[PDB]
Amino acid sequence: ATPLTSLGSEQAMFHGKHQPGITTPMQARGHLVAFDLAAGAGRKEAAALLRRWSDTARRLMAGEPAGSRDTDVARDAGPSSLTVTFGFGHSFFGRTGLEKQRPVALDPLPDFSSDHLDKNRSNGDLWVQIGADDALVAFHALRAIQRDAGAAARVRWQMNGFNRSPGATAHPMTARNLMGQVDGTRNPKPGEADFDRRIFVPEEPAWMANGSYVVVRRIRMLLDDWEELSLKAQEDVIGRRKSDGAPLSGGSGATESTEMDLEKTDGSGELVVPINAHARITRPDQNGGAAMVRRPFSYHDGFDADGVPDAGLLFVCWQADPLRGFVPVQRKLDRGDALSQFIRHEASGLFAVPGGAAEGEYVGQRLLE
Amino acid sequence: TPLTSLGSEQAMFHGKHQPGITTPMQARGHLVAFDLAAGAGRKEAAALLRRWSDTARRLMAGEPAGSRDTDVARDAGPSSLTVTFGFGHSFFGRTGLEKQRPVALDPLPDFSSDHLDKNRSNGDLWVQIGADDALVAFHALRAIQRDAGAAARVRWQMNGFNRSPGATAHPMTARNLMGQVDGTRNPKPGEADFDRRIFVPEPAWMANGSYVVVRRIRMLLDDWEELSLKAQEDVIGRRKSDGAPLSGGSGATESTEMDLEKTDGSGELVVPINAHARITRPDQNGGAAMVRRPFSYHDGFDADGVPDAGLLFVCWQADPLRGFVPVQRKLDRGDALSQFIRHEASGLFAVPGGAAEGEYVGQRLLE
Ligand code: HEM
Ligand code: HEM
């Protein structure tokens, strides 16, 4: 029996080889935030900020207050699987005299023909991902991180998301998105032999050892168009069934885990999994081994005047090198994916997320020290 | 209590009262107002409430929509979903139903501290959706909104959240984003004068209904969070740690009765004369009373770093003139809290009784 109290009592490690929020289980609530350094904040002020943030992270992730004038918003809750994760944008390095430690991996993402990016709501010197299974726990953490920045950095952009709660389903299972698709079946997983090679910078620039690169994309779903489609049309866009996430190449006996048959054909000769289906064309074996861990939140921020919902996927993917991950896959998807017609990339960020802090350290200490 | 309870718990659609009034607080909420379109009158409104009621019914039972289901809620339990419908003052002019417009829908006062967005206030129709799962909740919002079709547009829509089930070691009263214990003195079904306070007794189309007042109240968290603990506790008159009255001792808890006469060693009132939890009490307002059942909100930051965060205050009464209205008249300038909040949207809606088996909500008004 998993008790209901597990939701609050579950606690994620702050200290580790890798920062939390990469391999950590899906969380019900997320807040993504980007900060820009203030005028006259340099390396010294940035190192002080990351220390403040790390100390706050450590405390919050253990269910402990953020000091004397902790707001009490999270009081009485357990840690609720809170994680906080920190990253650095391309622009950070020229603000802090660290241009020589700027990884080539932060070179700007391509200008994809399908981009509709609000550049104000994109990019940033610093990125923080907050997730938890309790909304007060999560808001408390966002507010504490944001208040820790004080005058040394300002909020550039901030987005809210959500996922399925623990216990919503009779047994734990892969999540859904606002298209109604099963979302997360084929991620690389820890324990696979190539998982670290795919996802993390190895231990032997040196400050990124055991770090990863995240790509964030605010992707609006065109639900008004999507929801006029037949099931057959929606399933053809993905290549997997809405009911259980099994490949279209599968039988009634097929389930989520049954391997895709990418050569299966109709009586009529036509491929059962379409040639431009999203879950065909995104696979590492269709992309020279290009791979990523996808760990998103869904979003809904309202309706415009014509009733169009501002709803979609806060796409967050993780990779050792964007050029072997996000970038070549997106390059194919831009025009080549059946899904493109139904989505709109409306904001983006690429951040270097270092390894976990050890005892007595702050996140990014190797970089700033 | 197993973790699957989150999903498996089911609120009832059919009943004397609509769900979402006395129902326990939910982790996720969506509030939406609609305006009728040109060419939607009473017959179009009745069809709309029939559609909506059927969707509410299915969805509250954990079933897919009747048709064109999106699969977004598939695999999930009912997750305590509730759907609640009301009618605004303007509705009755739109549908030739002015003779059935309740007195109780007459416009709220223009409070001196109002800073109301007229475009995100009021509305012909209001729907309140809440659940403990966010995909269950979004799926319901989207289904209700798609039922509107040609009959009605979305006028405004706000998202809200609360504590999750299981977040605490055992069930406790809610907190808000000011970090206060919030809901201690909310009246409950078995308390003495509850029905008279909250429900129209069995125009007649409102029988067993209730009037809801919605206020989008921003919390001026930048100013609030620079106050000392002592100053914050003086604003409310209860402690943040445990929600006890300031008049309570070391052993006092949230439920301990407040002592409104108690003074300190220097003859000053221990619960301040303008504390919020003093001045809002029924016994300070001629018996005025309400059920409060809010959601917190956070919609991001403005350009200058100020959070668009606060309380989606939702309160329930048999008559606003014996609930929200006289209390808010008192609070407007008198309340220590008012300095750290701003009211930025408002709605007042008539929420009829719940649907019987094989009925739609609002049927006795719209037929
Ligand atoms: C809102 C936008 C998107 C939606 C709705 C969507 C939906 C899905 C779905 C339903 C699956 C199949 C189940 C699974 O394995 O998770 C999937 C797989 C995948 N998607 Fe997406 N996706 C979106 C955007 C992206 C983008 C922008 C990328 C990368 C540039 C991407 C990369 C992948 C990858 C790599 C897989 C796994 C392929 C495999 O190995 O089977 N997706 N996506
Ligand atoms: C952001 C706005 C507000 C906040 C933060 C707030 C907070 C609180 C808190 C902490 C309590 C004490 C605990 C409890 O009994 O629930 C309380 C009680 C109460 N508040 Fe509010 N409140 C707000 C707005 C309002 C408004 C607008 C009204 C009505 C006009 C209202 C009416 C009440 C009532 C009737 C009580 C219970 C009094 C009693 O009988 O003990 N509040 N509020």
Residue numbers in the entry:
A (entry chain B): 69 to 272, 280 to 444
B (entry chain A): 70 to 271, 280 to 444
From the paper:
One O atom is ligated to the haem Fe at adistances of 2.3 and 2.1 Å in monomers A and B, respectively, as well as making a polar interaction with the distal pocket residue Arg369. Therefore, we conclude from the structure and the spectroscopic data that the haem is in a six-coordinate ferrous state with an O atom bound (oxy­ferrous). The structures allowed the assignment of 100 K spectra to either a diatomic (oxygen) or monatomic (compound III) state, while the spectra allowed X-ray and ligand-soaking effects to be precisely monitored.
Furthermore, in situ X-ray-driven generation of haem intermediates in crystals of the dye-decolourizing-type peroxidase A (DtpA) from Streptomyces lividans is described. High-resolution crystal structures determined using synchrotron radiation are central to our understanding of haem-protein function. The correct assignment of crystal structures to the correct protein redox and ligand states is essential to avoid the misinterpretation of structural data.
